[PDB]
């Protein structure tokens with residue numbers, strides 16, 4: 219066994235912005251106290267992993283990205299009580315220390331031990347567990363799942379059902395939960411409402427599922443890629459609009475279609491202009507708009523505060539407002555109970571070594587989610 | 593006696609921006625169907641009246657401003673059923689038609705018949721009941737209370753308790769209800785929370801009373817005018833901070849004082865910069881910030897969407913989120929039962945004729961609410 223030993227394995231390293239991932243041989247240190255080393259089984263390619271490449275999302279490079287995954291505990295550090303060697307786990311990019319003021323708040327989920335607000339790319343102790351060619355490589359959001367093995371803090375891992383299909387439930391580690399929770403826990407979509415979902419990638423289709431689950435009467439998917447419409451309709455959208463077909467701004471189209479605005483809108487792209495558009499297209503007196511997409515680093519949007527003064531609510535959330543450690547295991551149980559379906563989001567499955575082809579798929583608009591298997 | 597006839601009376605006409613009000617003779621036409629002519633008893637000077645003068649708030653000039661008032665029904669037009677001559681009433685700048693999509697919505701209050709969104713400055717049928725110097729004069733939010741008599745649509749009037757003290761319950765027509773409701777109905781302030789209130793004018797002091805009524809444990813008042821602190825303390829502020837005393841930006845002071853940010857923040861001034869500061873000083877994961885202040889017309893603020901993505905909620909509302917015709921009568925009844933105090937808001941009581949001095953008091957920071965009496 220590898221317990222207690224430095225593991226040599228392959229990982230996808232991003233050495234510099236706007237380059238393909240380089241599949242390298244890396245050394246994965248053994249887990250210190252309160253850390254878990256996991257053997258990766260499957261990882262999804264999420265737009266947020268692409269944001270690191272594109273420089274949209276700023277985090278120390280070089281880096282092993284990937285945060286939407288599912289693996290098996292290989293070994294645990296000293297003091298680890300929550301998982302054992304052998305357990306199926308999902309690494310959590312939003313930790314749940316269970317102690318800070320947020321973890322104690324009934325509603326919040328943005329644990330103060332996150333590595334999200336100002337990414338350091340280190341373990342909780344400020345060190346890396348990864349070296350490549352002698353150089354220390356940064357972690358990504360405490361997860362770094364584009365690697366055969368990764369080391370995560372105990373606060374960033376959830377034990378799930380031993381029978382879960384790891385190549386499906388890897389989407390619970392981000393995409394699906396984010397989307398679904400965004401509609402059901404964050405916006406709290408109501409029965410009979412009209413919803414507008416901007417962006418129909420994996421997180422957007424999950425927002426659609428959540429809206430359909432909460433009973434939205436009408437779910438308008440909006441995307442500039444008309445090939446995403448059939449899948450959107452398949453998971454619940456009632457109509458799909460493409461902004462480029464109209465001579466009118468899409469907030470006007472949506473307002474006219476919904477008779478003065480939708481109840482709930484969601485920005486699931488990451489563009490400043492669509493965030494303001496999504497806010498705008500919601501009903502002025504009682505509409506709720508939720509930002510889910512991640513926008514370019516250090517860029518501000520410009521908006522007229524009168525949009526909010528009339529009564530609109532504008533909110534954002536990380537990971538669909540779910541308290542990670544408590545919810546991931548329940549979402550898996552729920553998936554195991556057929557309460558929701560993850561297959562419709564999986565368009566492609568590729569061996570890990572074809573990570574770059576998986577990113578070209580995403581970038582080209584041909585895939586929803588590509589699951590990488592190890 | 594004046595019923596069915598034109599009344600010649602005095603009213604404060606604003607002929608053009610940034611000029612003092614002109615006290616002069618106006619002709620007030622009798623009510624048409626579904627209209628009510630009211631004899632004014634008292635009207636308060638609100639910052640939003642001052643916005644009309646300054647050009648901040650755009651509405652057709654010339655105009656008879658004033659919206660926070662109480663009076664007695666002098667007469668009614670055909671079809672009027674909810675009020676009768678002699679009733680004590682409060683004119684409603686936010687109507688309650690009781691019929692549109694918003695009136696029907698459980699939460700909304702921004703009635704689709706408002707004259708707020710794109711001010712026409714007329715009655716609901718598109719005409720004015722006022723003539724001055726031989727010219728038609730515009731209404732102001734379907735109220736126009738700076739006149740001895742005014743005419744309002746039935747949907748813009750609530751009948752109040754026959755025993756109510758009109759010189760005090762005119763504040764229920766705007767300032768008090770807006771502040772109070774922003775805390776209890778819009779933000780939905782929780783027992784034990786920490787709240788920060790930016791701006792300690794009439795409206796902000798009412799927000800502090802709502803916060804105290806909701807059970808806030810800590811209410812921090814923020815104002816650049818330290819003379820407002822004593823009064824804020826008296827109505828419930830636990831602490832008051834003047835951003836000019838500190839070397840760091842106030843959001844940082846506020847975040848530190850509240851150990852990571854307040855639960856609820858209210859912007860009760862009308863500045864773009866303080867709207868963003870208010871949002872920022874709320875806890876990133878679960879804070880809620882409510883815009884109450886009215887910004888300068890057509891100006892956009894700039895903010896970083898990451899502020900919302902961690903989990904914050906940003907809302908605004910008009911008239912504290914209260915359905916106006918349902919809520920006013922009940923707030924007056926609560927007042928009559930001493931459920932809240934109005935007295936602390938009233939610093940000055942002046943005859944109508946000294947409206948310009950009343951505006952000067954406001955403009956110089958010496959007053960909270962000045963009530964004009966007729």
Ligand SMILES: NC(=O)c1ccc[n+]([C@@H]2O[C@H](COP(=O)([O-])OP(=O)(O)OC[C@H]3O[C@@H](n4cnc5c(N)ncnc54)[C@H](O)[C@@H]3O)[C@@H](O)[C@H]2O)c1
Pocket residue numbers: 263264265266269392393396416417418419420421422440441442443446461486487488489492509510511512513535536537538583586901
């Ligand atoms: N808030 C969170 O916790 C969280 C979790 C996961 C991902 N995200 C973010 O959610 C967004 C969605 O992720 P994804 O993986 O679903 O992405 P994706 O790239 O799969 O989907 C984006 C979709 O937006 C559409 N789109 C792009 N530009 C558009 C434009 N100008 N107008 C209309 N439609 C447009 C694309 O065509 C595509 O269908 C990304 O910004 C990602 O970083 C945030």
Ligand SMILES: NC(=O)c1ccc[n+]([C@@H]2O[C@H](COP(=O)([O-])OP(=O)(O)OC[C@H]3O[C@@H](n4cnc5c(N)ncnc54)[C@H](O)[C@@H]3O)[C@@H](O)[C@H]2O)c1
Pocket residue numbers: 527637638639640643766767770790791792793794795796814815816817820860861862863866883884885886887909910911912957960
């Ligand atoms: N949303 C609504 O329905 C509604 C209804 C009522 C009034 N309003 C708006 O609410 C605001 C408050 O009205 P009011 O009558 O209480 O006003 P006010 O002028 O009496 O009070 C504003 C307070 O803000 C303080 N202030 C000004 N500039 C400041 C700065 N840079 N920093 C910190 N504090 C500052 C002033 O010193 C004053 O104490 C206005 O913009 C008014 O138009 C909105």
